[PDB]
């Protein structure tokens, strides 16, 4: 059960509120999207322009391309304004948007198009070849829209059609619970599932969290993220636009901490969001060379924020980092808001929609100080912000419900004030530098190589990245004579070539056998335990 309005749409109910206010002269034209490429190109839309231009977006998707309410549109773009325009476009036209990363390889993309039966893909120069390799294998795929300075046979020209489109679109009266986005999400075993979010679970939820960061209507916030991750829709797009604030985007084509540091010291960025690894890379630089007195709010999600990282950032910049915690399925689940005291090593308290608790094997709420499983009350009322379920897979959804609670799959402890401390993933999912990696994905990749007869992929402790993907590999005997170091690199290269490179095995150990259950299932937990300390 849920307690929402019957209808909601971020675009008509939030974005267009800010456009009208400018139109009505009740607010001056206020910056919404400020994009830079680092090479001297900058573009800015105020809220009217953002509105007008994304209505153009919607008319491209629904008029030119004929996409219809409920159709699914894959979106694989780098950090260019058109991602924001397209996403808004989908929201207006009632299209289900499915972001992914430009790190994807052809098989990654095939898997998503076939699984989702997408009717459209909106891509850039990065993956176009990749897509063309597999498009003929996707019978539901009708529309291929390319965001590029070049045109290409078989691709519609987004930037041209956009410019040709009307600035008036009639926004669809989308329902609160109606599908708006699918985000593919990795699991403890098997390949990625389709996590479906509603118009409310993203848009209403973000409206209600808006401000936790410390952002005000007149500030600029820079979220540093691949456009594919849910971080992007919630913090780069919805958080600021809920408040009428401006969102900053740097193409940041190579993730360069020095460019980050120069950007912070050259623009009036008030808030920044990024995974802890971003703050760690930044700390490896010489921050004395930079000053950014305008920056006041630094937040993080995706990984545990190390007390030492928190400490050093404070020492080196005079600023706190306020942590938050969540997953694709739940969004922002816990946070340290601007006014809360920071407890090093704790990720904050429940998002305001959520009853978050530590729960036992039978689903009972545990007392403070007791380790258990972290859970969001979803019965009898399902809170605004929880996703709608795994598409086509209600069993897997049912499988993460225990009693009245949805299970995050993380262990934790709750203190006396309701602050949560993360105590580890309870399953085989790997978290490496803020990525959520399914072990089967990396295993299948390795198994394609003739050298690998059997493999198990588990997490390995790493100072810098927290945790890295490690493979245990049983070798085809022919290969026992190869140089190990050479063979390791060959295998690493192989994984990187067939699936998004971020998941490759940074460590590989060759072994004669993998431990198993009497039923013949590999005991990753066993390997994982031995690998830690
Ligand atoms: C409510 C929940 C919200 C959320 O938290 S959503 C989750 C948020 N998570 C994140 O944002 C993840 C953030 N972390 C990162 O982005 C980091 O990985 C970070 C900061 C960019 C550092 O990245 P890098 O080490 O440069 O690269 P990477 O860690 O992504 O690993 C990729 C490996 O492969 C390479 N690669 C990348 N693109 C490639 C390409 N197109 N072709 C061939 N190779 C490529 C890359 O060099 C790296 O390999 P290597 O370490 O150099 O051997
Ligand atoms: N603040 C944090 N501390 C520790 N782990 C986190 C934090 N935020 C996110 N995670 C991990 O990342 C997962 C979410 O991955 P994703 O679904 O890609 O957002 C969670 O289930 C946690 O395992």
Q: 409 CB less than 6 Å from ligand 1? A: no
First to last CA, the chain: 45
From the list 478, 486, 429, 483, the residue with the least C-alpha distance to 452 is 478
Ligand 1: centre distance to CA 328 (Å): 17
Cβ neighbours of 479 (radius 10 Å): 18
Where are the domains positioned within the chain? 1-426, 427-533
Q: 301 CB less than 6 Å from ligand 1? A: yes
Say whether 493 counts as a known binding-site residue: no
From the CA of 104, the nearest ligand is: 1
Rg (CA), the chain: 23
What's the token pair of residue 21? 């206010």
Burial 109-125 (b: 16+ CB within 10 A, else e): bbbbbebbebbbbbbbe
Ligand 1: centre distance to CA 11 (Å): 31
Q: Where are the alpha helices (DSSP H) in 435-507?
A: 439-447, 484-498
| Residue whose CA is at the smallest distance from ligand 1 atom 41 | 103
Contacts of 318 (CB under 8 A, 6+ apart): none
Contacts of 106 (CB under 8 A, 6+ apart): 130, 131, 133, 134
Longest alpha-carbon distance in the chain: 76
Burial 257-272 (b: 16+ CB within 10 A, else e): beebbebbbebebbbb
From the list 447, 428, 458, 426, the residue with the least C-alpha distance to 499 is 447
**Contact by Cβ (8 Å): 476, 489:** no
CB < 8 Å & 24+ apart, contacts of 165-170: 165/55, 165/56, 165/57, 165/59, 165/60, 165/63, 165/64, 166/55, 166/56, 166/59, 166/63, 167/52, 167/53, 167/55, 167/56, 168/55, 169/55, 169/56, 169/58, 169/59, 169/62, 169/92, 169/93
Query: Taking the mean position of all CA atoms in its chain, how far away is CA 493?
Result: 25
Contacts of 307 (CB under 8 A, 6+ apart): 344, 345
Determine the Cα–Cα distance for residues 420 and 412; give it in Å rounded to an integer: 7
From the list 18, 183, 2, the residue with the least C-alpha distance to 96 is 183
From the list 174, 201, 170, the residue with the least C-alpha distance to 94 is 174
From the CA of 192, the nearest ligand is: 2
Q: 466 CB less than 6 Å from ligand 1? A: no
Say whether 291 counts as a known binding-site residue: no
| Residue whose CA is at the smallest distance from ligand 1 atom 17 | 433
Overall resolution, Å: 2.4
Determine the Cα–Cα distance for residues 487 and 493; give it in Å rounded to an integer: 10
| Residue whose CA is at the smallest distance from ligand 2 atom 19 | 327
Q: Where are the alpha helices (DSSP H) in 148-292?
A: 158-164, 199, 205-209, 230-231, 239-243, 257-266, 276-283
Instruction: Return the bridge partners of 250, or none.
Output: 36
230 CA closest ligand 2 atom index: 19
Q: Where are the alpha helices (DSSP H) in 290-346?
A: 307-317
190: left (phi over 0), alpha (psi -120 to 50) or beta: left
**Contact by Cβ (8 Å): 238, 214:** no
Ligand 2: centre distance to CA 302 (Å): 5
Strand order in the sheet with 321-327: 42-46, 31-36, 246-250, 220-223, 271-273, 297-300, 321-327, 331-335, 349-350
Determine the Cα–Cα distance for residues 344 and 320; give it in Å rounded to an integer: 10
Q: What three-state secondary structure class fits 431?
A: strand
3-state SS, one letter per residue, for 59-105: HHHHHHCCCCCCCEEEEECCCCHHHHHHHHHHHHHCCEEEECCCCCC
70: left (phi over 0), alpha (psi -120 to 50) or beta: left
As to burial, measured by CB atoms within 10 angstroms (0-12 exposed, 13-18 middle, 19+ buried), residue 97 is buried
Q: Would you list the DSSP string of 258-284?
A: HHHHHHHHHS---EEE--HHHHHHHHT
**Contact by Cβ (8 Å): 369, 185:** no
User: Can you tell me which residue has the tokens 């190579």?
Assistant: 254
Say whether 528 counts as a known binding-site residue: no
**H/E run at residue 111:** helix 106-116
Q: 275 CB less than 6 Å from ligand 1? A: yes
Pairing of strands 321-327, 297-300: parallel
Instruction: Return the bridge partners of 198, or none.
Output: 179
| Residue whose CA is at the smallest distance from ligand 1 atom 20 | 278
Inter-axis angle of helices 484-498 and 439-447, to 10 degrees? 110
CA distances, 242 to each of 34, 146, 188, 210, 434 (Å):
16, 29, 34, 6, 25
From the list 232, 478, 256, the residue with the least C-alpha distance to 331 is 232
Give the CA count within 13 Å in the CB-facing half-sphere of 200: 19
From the list 156, 273, 266, the residue with the least C-alpha distance to 214 is 273
**Contact by Cβ (8 Å): 387, 396:** no
Say whether 280 counts as a known binding-site residue: no
Determine the Cα–Cα distance for residues 22 and 402; give it in Å rounded to an integer: 48
The secondary structure of residue 205, as a DSSP letter, is H
The secondary structure of residue 338, as a DSSP letter, is T
Query: Taking the mean position of all CA atoms in its chain, how far away is CA 42?
Result: 25
Query: Taking the mean position of all CA atoms in its chain, how far away is CA 153?
Result: 31
What's the token pair of residue 13? 């109910």
Architecture of the domain whose range is 427-533? 2-Layer Sandwich (3.30)
Determine the Cα–Cα distance for residues 140 and 181; give it in Å rounded to an integer: 18
Fold of 1-426: Rossmann fold (3.40.50)
What's the token pair of residue 8? 């909601």
Determine the Cα–Cα distance for residues 323 and 351; give it in Å rounded to an integer: 12
User: Can you tell me which residue has the tokens 């305001």?
Assistant: 352
Determine the Cα–Cα distance for residues 137 and 68; give it in Å rounded to an integer: 22
Ligand 2: centre distance to CA 392 (Å): 24
Best mutation site among 410, 426, 459, 503 for ligand 2 pocket (most ligand atoms within 8 Å of CB): 410
Ligand 2: centre distance to CA 407 (Å): 13
Q: 127 CB less than 6 Å from ligand 1? A: no
Q: 385 CB less than 6 Å from ligand 1? A: no
Query: Taking the mean position of all CA atoms in its chain, how far away is CA 103?
Result: 13
Determine the Cα–Cα distance for residues 55 and 50; give it in Å rounded to an integer: 8
Query: Taking the mean position of all CA atoms in its chain, how far away is CA 465?
Result: 17
């Amino acid at each position: 059960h849920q307690e929402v309005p019957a209808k909601f749409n971020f675009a008509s109910d939030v974005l267009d509120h800010w456009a009208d206010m400018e139109k009505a002269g009740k607010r001056p034209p206020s910056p919404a999207l400020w994009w830079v490429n680092g090479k001297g190109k900058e573009l800015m839309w105020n809220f009217r322009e953002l509105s007008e231009n994304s209505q153009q977006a919607a008319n491209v998707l629904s008029g030119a391309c004929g996409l219809q309410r409920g159709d699914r549109v894959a979106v694989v773009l780098p950090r260019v304004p058109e991602w924001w325009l397209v996403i808004l476009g989908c929201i207006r036209a009632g299209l289900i948007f499915m972001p992914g990363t430009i790190q994807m390889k052809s098989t990654d993309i095939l898997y998503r198009l076939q699984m989702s039966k997408a009717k459209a893909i909106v891509a850039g120069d990065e993956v176009i070849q990749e897509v063309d390799t597999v498009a003929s294998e996707c019978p539901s795929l009708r529309i291929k829209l390319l965001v590029s300075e070049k045109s290409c046979d078989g691709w519609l020209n987004f930037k041209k059609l956009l410019n040709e489109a009307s600035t008036t679109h009639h926004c669809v009266e989308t329902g609160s619970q109606e599908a708006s986005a699918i985000y593919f999400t990795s699991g403890t075993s098997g390949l990625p599932k389709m996590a479906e979010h509603s118009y409310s679970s993203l848009g209403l939820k973000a409206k209600m969290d808006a401000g936790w960061t410390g952002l005000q209507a007149s500030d600029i916030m820079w979220t540093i993220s691949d456009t594919g991750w849910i971080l992007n829709i919630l913090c780069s797009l919805m958080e600021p636009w809920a408040l009428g604030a401006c969102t900053f985007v740097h193409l940041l084509p190579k993730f360069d901490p020095l460019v980050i540091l120069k950007t912070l010291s050259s623009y009036p960025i008030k808030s920044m969001m990024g995974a802890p690894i971003v703050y760690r890379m930044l700390l490896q630089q010489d921050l004395s060379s930079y000053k950014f007195p305008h920056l006041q709010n630094c937040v993080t999600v995706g990984e545990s924020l190390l007390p030492e990282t928190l400490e050093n950032w404070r020492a080196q910049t005079g600023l706190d980092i306020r942590e938050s915690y969540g997953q694709t399925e739940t969004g922002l689940t816990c946070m340290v808001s601007k006014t809360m005291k920071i407890k090093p090593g704790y990720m904050g308290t429940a998002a305001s929609c959520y009853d978050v608790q530590i729960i036992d094997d039978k689903g009972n709420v545990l007392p403070p100080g007791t380790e258990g499983d972290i859970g969001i009350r979803v019965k009898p009322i399902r809170p605004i912000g929880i996703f709608s379920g795994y598409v086509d897979n209600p069993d897997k959804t049912a499988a993460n419900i225990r009693g009245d609670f949805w299970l995050l799959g993380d262990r934790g402890i709750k203190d006396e004030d309701g602050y949560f401390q993360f105590m580890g993933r309870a399953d085989d999912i790997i978290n490496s530098s803020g990525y959520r990696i399914g072990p089967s994905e990396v295993e299948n990749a390795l198994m394609e190589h003739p050298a690998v007869v059997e493999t198990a992929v588990i997490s390995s402790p790493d100072p810098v990245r927290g945790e890295v993907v490690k493979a245990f590999v049983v070798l085809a005997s022919q290969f026992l004579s190869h140089d190990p170091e050479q063979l390791t690199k060959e295998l690493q290269q192989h994984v990187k070539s067939v699936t998004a490179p971020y998941k490759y095995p940074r460590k590989i150990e060759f072994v004669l056998n993998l431990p198993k259950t009497v039923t013949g299932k590999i005991q990753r937990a066993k390997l994982r335990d031995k690998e830690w300390k």
